[model samples]
Target: RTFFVGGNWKANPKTVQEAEKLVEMLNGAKVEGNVEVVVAAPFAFLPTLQQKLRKDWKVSAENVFTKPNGAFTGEVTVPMIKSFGIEWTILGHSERRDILKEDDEFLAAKAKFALENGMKIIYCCGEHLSEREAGKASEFVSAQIEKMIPAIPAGKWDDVVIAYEPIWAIGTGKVASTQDAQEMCKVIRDILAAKVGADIANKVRILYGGSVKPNNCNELAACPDVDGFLVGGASLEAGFINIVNSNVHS
Candidate 1:
C-alpha cells in the first residue's frame, strides 16, 4: 500500500488567517517518499485550504451530510463539497461518534451517500476503553465494519480507507504501542478479507490514529498492517511534516 496520511484539523486554528498560515506551512514541506497526503480542515476553512494548500497534497472535509442537497438547514452535502473539487471526507471519527452521537447506522448511511456521490472516504472505527477492557476489541470493531461493508457499493473499495483509533487513546497523549496498533489493523484487514474479499482487503489502506506524534510516528509506520495515520494534534504543528515524511521508515 502507498502510505496514506490524513491530517484532521478538526474545528481548529480559531481563525481563517491561522488556517491559511497552516496551509502555507504545509505547502513548504519537502515530502520524502511515495505517499498519499490529505489534510482535512473545518468546513469554514476548506475553500481557502483548497485554493492555497499544496497541489500535490489533497484537501478533505471533516464531515458531510447523507444527502446531496435539500431542506437540511446546517448540513453540508456531497454536491456542495464536490463543487470545490474536493474528493475526500473523514467519517465516523471518534469525536463525531462519541460527542455528536453518530451511531453506526447513521455513519454507514453517510458512507453510502458520500461514495455514491463520487467522494472518497476515510471511515473510522475502533473499540472504546470499555470494549478493550472487556477483551472484546475485535468483536466490537468487527461489528462496526460489518455495518459499513454493505454500505460500500460494488467496486468502490478503491475509494475507501479505514482508520482504527482506539477511543481510550485519542487525544489522551496515549498512543497505542506498535504491537497494539499492528494487531488491530491486522484484525480489521482480516475482517475485510473475510467479508469483502482478499483483493479489496489487500488493496485498501488501513490507518492508525490517536495521539500520533513525531517522536513515535516512525515506529508506528513500521508496523506491518499500519498503512499510515489519521493524525490529530500533531497535524497542526510542524511535526506533521515529520509524520508525513515518516513513510520512508516503512
Candidate 2:
C-alpha cells in the first residue's frame, strides 16, 4: 500500500484568497517518501485548487451529484467536475448521511455513477455513537459496506478508497486508539476479501478518518492495516503537511 493521505477541507476558509494561501503553503512543504496525496475542497474552490495546487498532489470534491447532467439544480455532476481535470470525490460521508438525510440507496447510486464516469472515490462508512456503544459497530459498519459493494464496477476497485470514520470521534477532539483503528480497518479489508475477493481486497486502500493529527499520525501510520487518512480540521492547518509526511513511518 502506498500510503494515501487525503485532506478533506470540508467547507473551510472564508475566501478564495485563503484557499490560495493554503495551496501555497502546501506547495512549499517537503514531502517524504511515496504517498498519494489528494486535497478535497469545496465545489466553489476546486478550480482555484486545480489551477494552483502542486501537480504531484491531486484535487478532489467534498461531494458530487449522481447524474451526469440534468434537471438537478445546485448540484455538481461528475461530468462537470471531470471537465475541470478533477478526478476524485468523497461520498457516503457521515456529515451528508446525517445532516442532509442522504440514505444508503442514494449514496450507492452516487458511487455507481461516479465510478462508471471515470471518477475515483473516497467512500466513507462507520458507526455512530449509539451503534458503537451498543457493541454493534462491526455489524452496523458491515451493513453499510454490503450496500456499497454492488455499486462498484468489476475493474474499478483500484480507483476506490474506503475510509472508516467513527462518527463519535469526529469533531469531538477524540481519536481512536491505534489498536481500534487497526481493528476496524482490518474489518473493512476482511469484508472486501469475503465479498469481492482477496485480489481486490489486498490492493484497495482503507483509511482511518477521525481526529487524525501530527501527534497521533505516526503511531496510526505504523499500523499494518491503516493505509492512510481522511483528515478534517487539521487538513486546513500547516500540521497537515506533517500528517502527509507521516507516510514514511508506514
Candidate 3:
C-alpha cells in the first residue's frame, strides 16, 4: 500500500502569518519518499494553504456539513469546499465526537453525505481510556466501524481511509506504545476483512492518530498495519516534515 500522512492542524496558530510560515516550512522540505501527504487546516486558511503548498501534496478540510448547501449559516458545505478543489476531509475526529457531542449516527450521516458527493474521508474511530482499561477497546472501536459501514456509498471504499485514534493518547502528550498502535490497527483490519472482504481490508489504509511526533514516527511507521498517521500538535512544529519523512522508514 502507498503510505499516507496527514497533518491535522486543528484550530491552531492564531495568526495568518503563522500559517504562511508553516506553509513555507513545509514547501521548503525535501520529501524523500513516495507518500500521499494531506495537510488539513482550518477552513479559513484553505485557500491560502492550497495556493502556497506544493501541488504534489493535497490540502484537506478538518470537517464539513452533511448537505451541499443549507440554511445552516455557521457550517461549510461539501459543494463550497469542492468549489475550491479540496477533495479530502477528516470526519469523526475524537474532538468532534467528544467535545462537540457528535454521535455515531451524526458521523455516519456525514460520511454518507460526504462520500456521495465526491469527497474522500479519513474516518476516525477508537475507544476511550475506560474502555481500553476494561479490555473492551476492540469491541468499542469495532462497533463504531460497524455503524459506519452502511453509510459508505458503493465504490467509495477506495476513497476511504480509517484512522484509529486511541482517545486516551490524543493531545495528552501520552503516546501509545508502537505495539499498542499496531495491535489496534490490526484489530481494525481484521474487523474490516471479516465485515467487508479481505481485498477491501487490505486495500484500505489504516492510520494511527494519537500523539505521533517526529521522535516516534519512524518506529510507528515500521508497524505493518500502521500505514501512516493523522498527526495533531506535532504538525504545527518544524518536526512535521520528519513525520512525513518517516514514511521512507516504512
Candidate 4:
C-alpha cells in the first residue's frame, strides 16, 4: 500500500502572501518513498493551492456542505470544490464533531453527498478522553464507523479514506503512542473487515491524525496499521517534510 500524507492546514495563514509562502515551501520539498500527498487548506486558499502547489500533490477542502446549491450562506458546496478541479475533502473531523456539534447522522450525510457527487473523502472517526479512559475507545469508534458504513455508496470504497483522530490527543500536544496508534488503526481495520469484507478492509487506507510531529512520525509510520497521517500543526512548519518522508528508509 502507498503511504499517504494529508496536511490538514486548518484555519491557517492569515494572509494570501503567507499561504503562497507555504506553497513555496511545500513546492520545494523532496518527497521520498511512494506517497500520495494531499493538502487540505481553508476554503479560500484552495484555489491558490490547486493552481500553485505541485501538480503531483493534490489539494482538498477541509469541509463541504451537503447540497449542490441553495440558500446556505457562508457554506461551500461539493460542486464549488470540483469546479476548481479539486477532488478531496475532509469530513467528521474531531473539531467538527465536538466543537461544531456535528453528529454521526450529519457526517454520514456529508459522506453520502460527497460520494454521490464524485468527490473522494477522508472520513474521521475516533474516541474522546472519557471513552479511552473507560476502555471503550474501540467500541465508541466502532459505533461511529458503523453509522458511517451504510452512507457510502457500493463500489465507492476505493474513493474512501479513514482517519483516526483521538479527540484528547488532538491539538493538546499529546500524540497517541506508536502502540496506541497501531491498536486503534487495527481496530478500525477489523471493523471494516467484518462489515465491508476483507477486500475492502485490505484496500482501505486508515490514517493516524493527532499531534504528529517530525520526531514521532517516523516511528508511527513504521507501525503496521498506520498507513499514513493527517497532520495538523506540524504541517505548517518545516518539520512537515520529515513527516512526509517517514515512510522512506534512510
What total of clashing residue pairs does each candidate reach? 0, 0, 0, 0
Q: Name the 10 consecutive residues with the lowest summed lDDT in model 4.
A: 168-177
lDDT of each: 0.93, 0.93, 0.93, 0.92
Q: Model 3, residue 10: what's the lDDT?
A: 97
Worst 10 residues of 3 by lDDT: 167-176
Q: Which TM-score value belongs to model 3?
A: 0.97
Model 2 clash pairs are: none
lDDT tens digits by residue: candidate 3, 119-188: 9999999998878878999999999999999999989999999999989776555667999999999999
Weakest 10 consecutive residues of candidate 2 by summed lDDT: 168-177
How would you encode candidate 4's per-residue C-alpha lDDT over 130-225 as one tens digit per residue? 788899999999999999999999889999999999786755666567799999999999999999899999999999997799888988998988
Q: What are the runs in model 4 whose C-alpha is more than 4 Å off?
A: 171-175
Taking the tens digit of each residue's C-alpha lDDT, what string does model 2 give over 3-84? 9999999989889999999999999999988899999999999999999999999999999998989899999999989999
Deviation from native of the Cα of residue 150 in model 4, angstroms = 0.3
lDDT of 1 at 28: 88
Tens-place lDDT digits, model 1, residues 78-194: 998899999999999998999999999999999999998899999999988778878999999999999999999988999999999988666555556789999999999999999
* True lDDT of residue 216, candidate 1: 91
